[PDB]
Amino acid sequence: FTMEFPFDVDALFPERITVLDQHLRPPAVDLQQQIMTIIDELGKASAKAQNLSAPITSASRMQSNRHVVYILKDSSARPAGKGAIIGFIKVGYKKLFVLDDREAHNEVEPLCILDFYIHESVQRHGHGRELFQYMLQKERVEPHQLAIDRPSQKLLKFLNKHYNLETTVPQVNNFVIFEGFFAHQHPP
């Protein structure tokens, strides 16, 4: 994944952030396969960045799940003149059982952050925050209401910096939640 593709990304994705679900509908010569290729490459790049041995995001996985992907295109002009993709965030609701600090197991169904990647060359340029903000607005969720699948330390630093999030009770299910998640807690 280099950000660029052998087709015109700006024609494919007219909006700065494009939101796609299991149907992978092109915004309105196979445009859908262009989208599938972008997702495949993004997923492989994210996996490599997180030291995973295989992708957790792919076109086929999008088609077989109830996840939603937000894709950020590059709003600058590129020399090759066919646009570029910066990165993505993938979310989905999941049923979980989580332990609080009062010994209770709580059945919950929060929005979860499932994958999140910005191309290495343009990390720390604010793109991650932009994408995260757009997702929060569209999903109508606040950051402390989220669960995250096995977050990287980079993401924990990001969330503390931008949203003052602090992790709360550790779980046995590979998800992380933050202070404010439970009804008796208060967000930052």
Added chain:
Amino acid sequence: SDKT
């Protein structure tokens, strides 16, 4: 979790 898909990461496990």
